[PDB]
């Protein structure tokens, strides 16, 4: 293992934590006379700020709209933050990290924080299925090898 190549990337989790959380339910008593068939409009964003050398914070924003039209269920945004060490890669490879990988780390925390807020407003909980733009390149780029075989036992 001659680790002379940056394909591994020197990545480190310093700290993960919500910067901002918010929930709005204008029609919160209306839920009794509102039909539970709102169309979930998901929306996503990611940001970056250099705090120090190789130290980049990523702000993964998720915004969930739930509304039948004007008869709105709720609005719920969680701005998740994460202090990350991003070293070894630069520029376009770094743009793949803080634009896809690092917010994908932050998204489970944001998801659960939203779905808790849904339950607090006492609406139907709905968990958003994984979307990996980061892993999509691994899904695309096939390696080379395929044939395994040979295992069984040593004894």
């Amino acid at each position: 293992m001659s680790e002379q190549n940056n394909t591994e990337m020197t990545f480190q989790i310093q700290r993960i934590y919500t910067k901002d959380i918010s929930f709005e339910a204008p029609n919160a008593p209306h839920v009794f006379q509102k039909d539970w068939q709102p169309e979930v409009k998901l929306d996503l964003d990611t940001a970056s700020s250099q705090l120090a050398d190789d130290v980049y914070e990523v702000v993964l924003r998720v915004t969930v709209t739930a509304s039948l039209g004007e008869e709105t269920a709720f609005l719920c945004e969680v701005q998740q933050g994460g202090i990350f060490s991003i070293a070894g890669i630069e520029g376009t490879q770094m743009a793949h990290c803080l634009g896809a990988y690092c917010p994908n780390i932050l998204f489970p925390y944001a998801r659960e924080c939203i779905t808790s807020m849904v339950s607090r407003g006492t609406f139907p909980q709905l968990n958003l299925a994984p979307v990996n733009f980061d892993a999509l390149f691994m899904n695309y780029l096939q390696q080379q090898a395929g044939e395994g075989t040979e295992e069984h036992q040593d004894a």
Partner: protein, 42 residues
Amino acid sequence: DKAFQDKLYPFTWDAVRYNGKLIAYPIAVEALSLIYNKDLLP
């Protein structure tokens, strides 16, 4: 008389005798769809 042995712990409370099992207030909130108008990520 001051029976210094009883103290400020004459009861534990180890039960919560809740014989009225429910789920929530009588109204079905358990209904939501329209998640992913498309398929999965391949």
